[PDB]
Each structure stands twice: as C-alpha cells, then as structure tokens.
Amino acid sequence: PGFGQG
Amino acid sequence: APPCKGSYFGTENLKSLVLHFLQQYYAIYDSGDRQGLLDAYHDGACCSLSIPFIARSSLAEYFKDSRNVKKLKDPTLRFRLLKHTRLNVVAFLNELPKTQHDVNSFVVDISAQTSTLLCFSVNGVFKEVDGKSRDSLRAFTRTFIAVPASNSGLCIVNDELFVRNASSEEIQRAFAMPAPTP
Amino acid sequence: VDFKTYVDQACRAAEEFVNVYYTTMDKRRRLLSRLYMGTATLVWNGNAVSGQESLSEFFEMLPSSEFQISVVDCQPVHDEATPSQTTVLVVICGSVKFEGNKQRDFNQNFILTAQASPSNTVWKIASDCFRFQDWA
Numbered sequence: 001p002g003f004g005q006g
Numbered sequence: 007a008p009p010c011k012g013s014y015f016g017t018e019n020l021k022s023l024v025l026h027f028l029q030q031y032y033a034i035y036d037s038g039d040r041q042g043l044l045d046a047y048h049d050g051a052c053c054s055l056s057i058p059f060i061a062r063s064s065l066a067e068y069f070k071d072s073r074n075v076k077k078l079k080d081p082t083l084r085f086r087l088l089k090h091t092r093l094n095v096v097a098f099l100n101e102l103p104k105t106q107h108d109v110n111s112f113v114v115d116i117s118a119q120t121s122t123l124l125c126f127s128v129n130g131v132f133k134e135v136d137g138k139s140r141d142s143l144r145a146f147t148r149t150f151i152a153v154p155a156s157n158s159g160l161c162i163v164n165d166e167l168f169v170r171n172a173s174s175e176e177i178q179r180a181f182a183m184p185a186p187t188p
Numbered sequence: 189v190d191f192k193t194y195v196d197q198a199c200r201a202a203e204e205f206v207n208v209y210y211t212t213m214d215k216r217r218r219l220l221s222r223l224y225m226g227t228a229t230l231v232w233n234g235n236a237v238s239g240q241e242s243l244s245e246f247f248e249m250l251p252s253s254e255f256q257i258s259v260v261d262c263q264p265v266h267d268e269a270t271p272s273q274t275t276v277l278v279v280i281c282g283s284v285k286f287e288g289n290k291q292r293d294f295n296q297n298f299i300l301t302a303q304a305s306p307s308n309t310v311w312k313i314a315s316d317c318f319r320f321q322d323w324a
Binding site for chain 2: 191192195196199202203206229230231232233234235236249250251257258259260261262263264265266268269270271277279281286289295297298299314315316317319320321322323324
C-alpha cells in the first residue's frame, strides 16, 4: 500500500 | 493519557509529499486568485465549510455557506450547501475572504492511506488580508482526502474546511515576539 | 447512480453513527471499540493507535468522558479513493470533559465504511483522527 502504486 | 504530540506523518516520504502539496496549494490560495486550484481538484470533487455553532471579529462571511448536518435537517438544503465538481468547488473558494496562512506552523495528521487514498487533516491559523475583518486571526482545521495525481502529485476529491476564531491563547502565542532571555 | 442520493445517505449515516458514537463513548465505553473495523487505526493528538485490539485497550485507559457535539458535516467519498467501497467522510466539532482535566474543545474526523448484510447496512469507522483544539 504505497500511495499511487498498483 | 498519551502525551499530546504535534504533526503525524508516518513516513518521511508522505511528510515531504504532503508538506510540498500544502506549500503549492496555499501559495495559490493566498495569491489573490485561487483559480490555479482547478488543477488541484478532481472534476467531481466535493467541498463544504463549517463554523462553530455556538466579541472577536465576525465570521458572518462564512455563515452563508456553513454546513452543519446536526443543526440543519432538510435533505435538499443539506445537499445545496455542498459544493460539487471542481468548477463549483473552486468558484466557491474564490468567493471567500482573501487570506494569508502560516503554512510552516501547520500541524498535520495523515490518518488514512492506501494505494489510491490519502486522508490528512490540517490545523493552523490565517489572517484575512482585507474586507471588514482585515488583520483578524482565524483558526481552522481542514480535511483533505486525495487520490494519486498523474504527476506524482495529489488530486483532492474531498475537502472539508472548518473555520473558527483563534482563541486568546492562540493569538497571544502567534503574535508574541519577546526579547530573548537566559 | 444519482449523486444526490449518495449525499443523502452520507448525511443519514453520519447523523446516525455520530449520535451512537458519543453516547457509546460516554456511557458504554467498553462497546465503543466495536464501531471500528479490525484493521482500523486512530490518530489521537499525534499519537497513533493500531488495530481493533489496541483501540479497545486505548479507550479503556482513557478517563470517564463527557462529550457535547455541536457541529457535524459529512461528504460521500469519491470512488477513485475507495474503489468499489462505499465510504463517508465525517468531521465533528464539540467539547469534552475527561475525569480530572478541564473541559476543552476538539476536532475529530473519521471515515465510515459501509458493510452490507441481511437486515441493514452497518457503518464502521475505518480510519479515525482526534485532536484537541488546544493540545498546544
């Protein structure tokens, strides 16, 4: 859960 | 009872991220024209303002668009007080008194975070730079929730701003500039 | 689906939840921890309390409380934020006296998430934030 990554 | 601490960021990564966002956001906010904010808000973003329900300067300027579900019950009036879409969001923001915040004194709390969401609250003070309440010191808590921006930035989809009058304790502090002593 | 209808549901659930939340906080503290999700967190005056269990513990250690809510606003969270998840943003403002400390004003916000079930959808706090206006 990194802001942005997915 | 846990000891009251200041800003909470979790990771220095989000700290620099969020802090950078606030610098840019409020640089435009206090510029004289908040239009540059149309790039900070999502097309279908929401925004609403609330003030204390309760002899310092007057907040009559914020009373007109004040949204308090606890006090206001009509679903239709409730609905109208909520600004929806960046156009309406920013158009509204530009109607508010010109300002000048103390960004570096902001106390921020990043409360939620996923890969697509980042909720954080901002507490601080700001001077109204003109109008009938010129030089008055307001206090505020503002909650944003952002989705990742195409440029490693933030796109605000939700913004709840609570405006109040700084308490005599806060004002005393903010304006104190005493001679240094040992 | 109609945007106004998400706004009305937000008001309803915020209106409703809030009332329960403070009544439970003040008069049934031992229950307040079930209005949260197991993964939920809380940022109490800059302090981060982790998980449904630590939250339960955290509320016990706090002193007998007495809240008075004067302000409530809410908004339906945009779906790009909570994909496929129906959530509501609620910001509260009121006063509170804890046993052994002067009464002070506070600001608190949290995100409610809707859990669908048989009878009725249930809202639980997914993320919570609370800070005294004078923590200073």
